[PDB]
Every structure is written in C-alpha cells, then in structure tokens.
Amino acid sequence: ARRLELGEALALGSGWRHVCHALLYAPDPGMLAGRIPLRYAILMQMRFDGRLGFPGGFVDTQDRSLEDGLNRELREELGEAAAAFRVERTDYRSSHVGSGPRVVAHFYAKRLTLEELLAVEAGATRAKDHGLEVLGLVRVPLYTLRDGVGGLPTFLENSFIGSAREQLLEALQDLGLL
Amino acid sequence: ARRLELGEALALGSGWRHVCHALLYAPDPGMLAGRIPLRYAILMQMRFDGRLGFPGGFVDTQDRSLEDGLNRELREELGEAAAAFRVERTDYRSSHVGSGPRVVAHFYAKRLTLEELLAVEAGATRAKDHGLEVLGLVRVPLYTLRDGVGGLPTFLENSFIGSAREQLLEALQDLGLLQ
Ligand code: NA
Numbered sequence: 001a002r003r004l005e006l007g008e009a010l011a012l013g014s015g016w017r018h019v020c021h022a023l024l025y026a027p028d029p030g031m032l033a034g035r036i037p038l039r040y041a042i043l044m045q046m047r048f049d050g051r052l053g054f055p056g057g058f059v060d061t062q063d064r065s066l067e068d069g070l071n072r073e074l075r076e077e078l079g080e081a082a083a084a085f086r087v088e089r090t091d092y093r094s095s096h097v098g099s100g101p102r103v104v105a106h107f108y109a110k111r112l113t114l115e116e117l118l119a120v121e122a123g124a125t126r127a128k129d130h131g132l133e134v135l136g137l138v139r140v141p142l143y144t145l146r147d148g149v150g151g152l153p154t155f156l157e158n159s160f161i162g163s164a165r166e167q168l169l170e171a172l173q174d175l176g177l178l
Numbered sequence: 179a180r181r182l183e184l185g186e187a188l189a190l191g192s193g194w195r196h197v198c199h200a201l202l203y204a205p206d207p208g209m210l211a212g213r214i215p216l217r218y219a220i221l222m223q224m225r226f227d228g229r230l231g232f233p234g235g236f237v238d239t240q241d242r243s244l245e246d247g248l249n250r251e252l253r254e255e256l257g258e259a260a261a262a263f264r265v266e267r268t269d270y271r272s273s274h275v276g277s278g279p280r281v282v283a284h285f286y287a288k289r290l291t292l293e294e295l296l297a298v299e300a301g302a303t304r305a306k307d308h309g310l311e312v313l314g315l316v317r318v319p320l321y322t323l324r325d326g327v328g329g330l331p332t333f334l335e336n337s338f339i340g341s342a343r344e345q346l347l348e349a350l351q352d353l354g355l356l357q
Contacts, residue, residue, distance in 0.1 A: 032226060032310055041309065046316040048210060049323060050333030122303045131219065131317065132210055138224040138314035145227060155228030158336040
C-alpha cells in the first residue's frame, strides 16, 4: 500500500483506473441494551464476493470528476435516497495506491443526519445492485463488549475488500473513537 | 457440536435455555453479471457482536412451543413481513448443545417465495431489533467466482456465531441448494 497526494493521483497517466468509496455516517444517540452508546451509524456493504466494503465504484470516461463518478456509482448501489445529498471534494479523505492492479482508491467520508442515513439504509434493497453486486448493508459496531472481543474487534475479523479495513480504522481514529 | 434428537433436547430441564434460529430462503433465477446463477436467496444477519448468524432468538416462559418462540422472535428481528409465513415443526432440522451456559440451539430451514423474501429484506430496517441487536441482513453467495475463492468460500471466512457456519453448510447439502 502507498498513500498518495490527491493532486499527484489526479495527474497519474490515463492508463490507471480510479475508484471512489464513501463512508456514510450519522450521529446516533441510541444505546445498545440501554447501556452501550452507539455513537454513530456507519454503513458498510457485503459485496458479491463475500467481502465487506464501502459503497462506491469505478470512475469511468463519461465522468468529468472523481465526485460525479462517485455519486453516479453511489446511486446505483444505494438507490434514490443517495440523491438526497452529494459527496463532494470537501468530503475527500485519502488516496491509496496498492501494487497489483493499476488502481488508485480514493476514500470519502460524508456526514449526514440520522434521518438521511436511515432513509439510505431503508431504500437500499430497491437499488439496482441489490441481490446482485451487493448482498446487503451492515452497520459497524463502534463499541467493544465486556469480553474485549465482541463488537468492533470481531467485526474487524470479517473479510474486507482492498483498503476498506484501513480506510475504516483511519476514519474512526479521526472521529475520536480510538 | 453434540447433536441431540429433539425429544431429548426438550427433556433437558429447567435451567436449560432454548434458542431457535431459521434459515429463510427462496428460489432466485437471477444471474450475477448475466452469467453466474444465484440459485437461491438465503438470509443471514450481522449481529450486534460483529458475527454473522441466522435470525431468531430465545424461547421464553410465555411461549407455548419452540415454533411460537421462533416466529415471535423472527417478527422482532425482521419486522412485519416475517408474519406472511409461519415456521413450523416440518421446517425443523436439528438441535445441538450450544456455546453458552446450558443452551440448546434448535435450527429450522423455511422455504419462501422470492416475493416473500424480498419483502422481509425491504422491511427489515423498521424491525424493533434493527440498529440494536441486529446490524443488517446479507445474502449468502452460493457461487464460486472464476478465481476459485470469491463468493461462498470467502463468505465462509467471516465471523460466525455459535455453530451457524455448520448449520448453513449442512442445510446447503441436505436441501440441495448448490451444484
Ligand atoms: Na430479540
């Protein structure tokens, strides 16, 4: 893996492919078992290959920016509820270049209202990709249970796509969660 | 784990707790990328502990039977659309001594129409447990991708509760859901 400057990434040869994924989240006041604060509702997706990842996809020649790519792809995966907002350049977090495929993976985090995020959750089964490219959404448990293993640490033992695990860890550190 | 016949499992006494789970599935003629047959939609659930399991829960004092407990629990976990069908004794598959102090886990498999199963998925975010006890539904991918790893093999590498993994595989074999 290799962190790359955005300007650097945009200037990569025409050969390279770009993908954009977004962490959609909202403040959540709720309490699991009336005891353990949820803190935030964060969405991930089980992909057709059995790995957990974030919603998004490939930027294509038809797209004029990373962001039009992302939002276009977001609407496929999540359905019309995703068109209630737009992930923009101001939501951008990172670009990562692995080895293997010539792909740069850009990460975005978009804060929403709990209402908005819930509506995205509730409509995702009517999205184009549901039951095909996408197997279903999950929430990320931000809490660690009393045994120190259940909740977030066990969630992180699941199989993840690409940099999604790294991308999530980083975004939680930046939210003051650990 | 140690399989018990249903009559013996039921004969366990007083301090033993009973938990009931259902594999809900439906035929699906969909083709991934126009070429990989889905065969069936099968539901599992990301639990509050980050583990994948099947929907259901604990039978309580007020339930008349295992089946009443299971259907009640499914209504709580999945929401209203779970009440379009009823999981019966005919759907029962197995009982095992679970991981947990004195717990027997009963397992059921229930075939639905696709319409019924889509409706369980569509309503699931409004259920009582959603966002709390449960974190979200996912379909079990039954195919293996060209690389020989993506799909079912990789899915089987996720974190599972109790013996959910083993209940899935057995059910996949006995119900003839793979090729
Ligand atoms: Na419950």
